[PDB]
Design a protein around this ligand. Structure first.
Ligand SMILES: CS(=O)(=O)Cc1nc2ccccc2[nH]1
Length: 168
């Protein structure tokens, strides 16, 4: 049972808890709790490899800056979760990605881009805007709603595969 550390980083109003809990105990929480640091751990069968996935839900407040470098250095994977109900958060990803590069010290990093609330009718961002951009970076774009549970496991399995490819 190999250990995999996945840190969840997103913006405010994305509902990261709705994604994490949906995978942990398969529960959808509509409520928005001010998460500071929530530890999660789940055992999944990655294409046959049952491993231990360590997940940490961080805060979305800019107040935590000095502690940012701390968790970003121990995180094997970075779960960039944003909501397509806001076009501002789509730009904030660049700030995070650019910073992550500074903490990773490498251009090669198994990261993907996902968008929650893809089931909301207030969708102001289209998939093309994300696909075209993701094409440039060369990163797989996966759209999964944590409300209806559409390819949730698949989105996590793909990430682990990317990490394994980097390892070996
Ligand atoms: C039970 S735990 O070890 O606190 C959960 C966790 N999730 C993580 C993600 C990245 C790095 C360390 C991480 N630790």
């Amino acid at each position: 049972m190999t250990e995999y550390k996945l840190v969840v980083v997103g913006a405010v109003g994305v509902g990261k808890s709705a994604l994490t809990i949906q995978l942990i105990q398969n529960h959808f929480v509509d409520e928005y709790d001010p998460t500071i640091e929530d530890s999660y751990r789940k055992q999944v069968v990655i294409d046959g490899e049952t491993c231990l996935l360590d997940i940490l839900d961080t805060a979305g407040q800019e107040e935590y800056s000095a502690m940012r470098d701390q968790y970003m250095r121990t995180g094997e994977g970075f779960l960039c979760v944003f909501a397509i109900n806001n076009t501002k958060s789509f730009e904030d990803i660049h700030h995070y990605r650019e910073q992550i590069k500074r903490v990773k010290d490498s251009e090669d990093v198994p990261m993907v881009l996902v968008g929650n609330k893809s089931d909301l009718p207030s969708r102001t961002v289209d998939t093309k805007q994300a696909q075209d951009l993701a094409r440039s970076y060369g990163i797989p774009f996966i759209e999964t709603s944590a409300k209806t549970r559409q390819g949730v496991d698949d989105a996590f399995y793909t990430l682990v595969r990317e990490i394994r490819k980097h390892k070996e």
